[PDB]
Amino acid sequence: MKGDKKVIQHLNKILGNELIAINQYFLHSRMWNDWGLKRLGAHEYHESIDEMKHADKLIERILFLEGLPNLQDLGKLLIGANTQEMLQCDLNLELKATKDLREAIVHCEQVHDYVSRDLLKDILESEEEHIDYLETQLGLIQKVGLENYLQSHMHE
Amino acid sequence: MKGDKKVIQHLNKILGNELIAINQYFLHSRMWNDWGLKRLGAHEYHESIDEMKHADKLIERILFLEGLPNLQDLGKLLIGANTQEMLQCDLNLELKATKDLREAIVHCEQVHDYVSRDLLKDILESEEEHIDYLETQLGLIQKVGLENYLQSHMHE
Amino acid sequence: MKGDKKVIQHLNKILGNELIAINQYFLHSRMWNDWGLKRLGAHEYHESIDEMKHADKLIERILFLEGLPNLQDLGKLLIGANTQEMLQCDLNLELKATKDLREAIVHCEQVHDYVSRDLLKDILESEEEHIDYLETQLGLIQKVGLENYLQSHMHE
Amino acid sequence: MKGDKKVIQHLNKILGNELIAINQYFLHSRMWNDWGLKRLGAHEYHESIDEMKHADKLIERILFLEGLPNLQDLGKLLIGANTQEMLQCDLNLELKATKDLREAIVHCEQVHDYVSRDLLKDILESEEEHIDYLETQLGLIQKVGLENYLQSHMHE
Amino acid sequence: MKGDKKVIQHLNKILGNELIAINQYFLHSRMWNDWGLKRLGAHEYHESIDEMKHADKLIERILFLEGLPNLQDLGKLLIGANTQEMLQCDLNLELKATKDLREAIVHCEQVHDYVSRDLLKDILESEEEHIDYLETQLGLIQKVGLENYLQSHMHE
Amino acid sequence: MKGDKKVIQHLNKILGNELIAINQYFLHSRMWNDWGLKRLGAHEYHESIDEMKHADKLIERILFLEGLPNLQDLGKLLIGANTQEMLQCDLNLELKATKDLREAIVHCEQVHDYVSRDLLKDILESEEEHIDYLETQLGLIQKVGLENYLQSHMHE
Amino acid sequence: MKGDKKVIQHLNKILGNELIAINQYFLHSRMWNDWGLKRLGAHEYHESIDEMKHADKLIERILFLEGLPNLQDLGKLLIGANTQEMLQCDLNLELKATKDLREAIVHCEQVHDYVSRDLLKDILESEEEHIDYLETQLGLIQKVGLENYLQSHMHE
Amino acid sequence: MKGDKKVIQHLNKILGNELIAINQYFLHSRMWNDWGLKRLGAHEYHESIDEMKHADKLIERILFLEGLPNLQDLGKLLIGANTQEMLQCDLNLELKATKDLREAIVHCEQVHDYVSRDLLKDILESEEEHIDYLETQLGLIQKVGLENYLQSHMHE
């Protein structure tokens, strides 16, 4: 079913974002495991699977709309070098992502692609939850102290 | 455990190849699903996942060796336009990946990184099993014909 | 809860389309069975139950809004004479139904009937999935040939 | 994630409506239980639980958006003295609650808080379902007569 | 038990033929698996096992009759170039085998070795069941075409 | 994958050795059953099966490398006439076979066919385990006496 | 099976390193248990089991190659006086040990003792995994603080 | 608990005997497995585990009494070259171990360390159970003959 050209562009933009987040979060997860923060490495691993699942849904939507999913153009990974910076890097990406989700939803609505809007809104709900997690983690570092924070994520 | 700088470099080259394969195969899977060749899309999906797992091990070995895993630099996806092209592209990708795996194993031997060698060999075994799959599909397209081959991959 | 008059007109329009589809898809199903294409007959039967359930949800919503559901007016069925026409006729019908759905959703948002919009959106998502199936089937008749496509749909 | 000040004002306005509904439906339930109308009691109890669960989701969402949920300001409970009064009071409350949900959804949409909109639309759907229930009971009273309607709600 | 010298000789010829069949059918099996015709691969494998169990029974009997089993002399494998010739090569071999089997049986009856005879008839029956399978496949290639026959044996 | 001609010749040589072992162990197995040493017949039968499984793995590899497995050329069986000779015969062959296995691994490294090397190393470990069993069996005959060694192998 | 003199020399060297780790890690385990750091004691107890199983494999290999395992000679145990020093001592011992495994693997390849090489590579992998653990723990002691690190290992 | 200094010397002397017994019985065990006398090898393996378990109890006690357990000094293993010599080496070793245990118990009593005394008495009881096994095996060799004796420990 031929979709709106700019909807497909918006979708391919969100996909771009999901593709960065997949790589960024898989690396942070394997970093945290390598440092012995097993509980963070495991949580971050599932945040990366979630983004893979969003990508799958966006790729399927684009092919159905007779577009070309663009898995080639990979933007800037935000790699942290310590725990707080990695969580902050995850948050700065998710916030870039949700800005682009709002603009894409705005446009689906103008062109009446109500199903693409519903799909993006479900991704946006997932991303807002992840923002809530990340912001909470940066909160706890402050409330229990960095040493305690890292101590609480050594084991599962 | 600080490892050979060039072993890490080899590991990241193998990692870069895996990241292409992941995207290229995942894209091909969802194209075969879009066209209703669901037996092909399922099988290509699991090739995409197998490369996802090799990437996981490579990343873990790189971080253990105190290298920095490179997930930023995505090489060239080989995206086909029809079933015979998509299979042939995957095969070309796989043949380049096995050239690189062999060179990396040769280097692991020289510097005595026998465990990295063993990982790369397990991946190499897997990449050769995929090449057997691919060569065999292209062979079947000639033995039964393209129409019959697509027919047989319509349903699971 | 007295609903908006034009919303009720729009829901009755959608309902009229659903009623056509019910009958068109059920006849096509039964013709496919009569011809020995049982995979098609079975698939299309479920396609028409799904329309039946959509019509249930529209009938309930119209009565809740204190309108009178119109099951008396039945528009033109698009009945095909062979598997390729029958598939294309189904698609032509779904394409007219998504146009009406989008127009009914537009009005629902104008008058803040956000619950009716969400019901229509869920129907629209269903309709598009059907469109995906039909386009794909027609695409397969081209890729594998009609004789092979029909053969693949003789047996369950 | 700092949300929009008027979004939070609206959410808290929706929250305050739930907080009335909880108290009002919970008292009416205990009144019907006290009178021996156990089926009305048990059903109204579950309507209070439903509003309690809506209030939780609002509270959760207001805090994520970094506002302060307002559980201090309690508006006018509409307590009835007999079944007909109480059903009508419940229905007047829910008709107020839906007017306020529509105004807030209009505002979430204007600022692109699409997640807050979906949350409010989900509550809106539950409230309309309660309105069907209420209008229907008041309709049954006229059809079967007050003394028969009460009879049918004595037992569970 | 000291057996007849020419019975042992006949037995050891029958064993020679089983040994060709074992290797020939196993290589055809793995050949069909290399080509992706897993249904012929699976079936021809079980024919190889079946000839293995016959060879077992002939060795036990030869030794009980106090002769030396001959596993050293291996006749000519007829290895086929494609699916059709592999089936015809198996059939050629089985037809030679049935002939030796009937001479062996004739002689067994002459010297009153009725138990050897009964073992040989049991093998002969299995050989004729296999000849039926072989003739039947070759007929299916003429009836449905080579492309269709091969397609039907891609998937198990 | 066209493999190295010399690798394919090495594999075909290792296959020839396994083909000899299959027949040799199978005959020794069935002689020990004819003589009442069931525990030896049972153990040796499984040595025959394990060689058959090596044979299988090599055929699949040779075909994958686009060579032609040689099942036609059957070297000299070393059949013994009494228990100690049969054991010593089995041992002579396994020592011949490990030597060839080592020569082919050497050549698989020189040409970077690490997967083939891995398969041959697995076979080699198994053939070394058979050598331990054989040396040990012969050593036990020295320690307990041949009468006692055969007695200990009458029953399972 | 008479093995190479220098391979047996190398193998007895690995065993002697295993016997040191066995005792060192057991003692450290019982020290952590005595101080009430039961989680460290349990894990250290299991690393000591791990070295006990490698020693078993080395002993069995040496004896198969008709060497004499040397369980008499016992090198310097590196015993720490506190958690940080005990982990560092384990790490220094594991680093001496992987050096000797590498030299041993080198010599195994020279004389074509491919089975011994594969057993030592298996050990080498286990040692590296254990090295990753030790470095990770020292890193955590830095990043969470010693008191917090110890606290996390009081209980199981 | 500041333990008596001579108790702790005694305890480390019994520990040093245990450490010899561990390595000696383990070595004999793998020697008997390698010769195919699997029953002796299994029984000797468990004798080694039991001494490992005594050693662990001693280490804990020494640490409790605030001694430094001594795993560095390893005395003279008694390794035989055949079964009877091995059995008699174990018996010589156990006979030295129980003389040291009796001496350590005496001193424990004289200083009122009744808990250490009890631990030692339980080890002694087990050492006397091993002496009973050993003496009985040597007597069996005399009664049934070494050839029969060894025959009876060939299999499990």
Ligand code: HEM
């Ligand atoms: C650096 C790149 C990637 C890495 C390291 C990676 C890693 C993984 C891993 C480890 C798994 C779990 C497999 C298993 O244990 O069975 C997985 C699953 C999966 N991956 Fe990836 N992946 C990557 C990229 C992608 C991409 C590009 C996509 C799709 C566009 C994707 C889609 C999926 C999906 C759908 C699953 C299944 C998860 C589920 O349904 O539970 N991944 N990936």
Ligand code: HEM
């Ligand atoms: C206004 C028109 C119709 C409505 C609202 C309607 C509604 C429904 C619903 C809700 C179901 C049950 C779905 C479920 O399993 O949840 C159903 C079942 C079914 N309908 Fe319809 N339907 C309509 C017209 C038709 C027509 C025209 C036909 C055939 C010519 C038909 C044939 C069937 C059949 C065979 C079933 C299966 C029921 C069973 O086996 O239990 N329906 N319908």
Ligand code: HEM
């Ligand atoms: C090319 C030479 C041969 C090959 C490649 C081969 C292969 C095999 C394989 C793969 C199996 C199955 C093992 C499993 O269960 O995974 C098997 C079983 C067996 N083989 Fe062979 N074989 C060969 C020659 C022989 C010969 C010469 C004999 C006897 C004279 C024989 C007798 C048997 C028997 C009795 C079984 C057990 C069958 C059953 O009951 O399942 N094989 N063989």
Ligand code: HEM
């Ligand atoms: C040459 C030296 C040693 C060797 C070859 C050895 C070998 C083994 C083996 C193979 C096991 C069985 C573990 C399993 O398979 O799960 C074991 C268990 C064990 N070892 Fe040792 N070990 C040695 C020295 C020691 C020492 C010196 C100690 C104590 C100071 C010790 C303490 C233990 C304990 C407590 C167990 C568990 C026993 C049980 O409950 O089963 N080992 N050992």
Ligand SMILES: [K+]
């Ligand atoms: K066909």
Ligand SMILES: [K+]
């Ligand atoms: K703490």
Ligand SMILES: [K+]
């Ligand atoms: K005896």
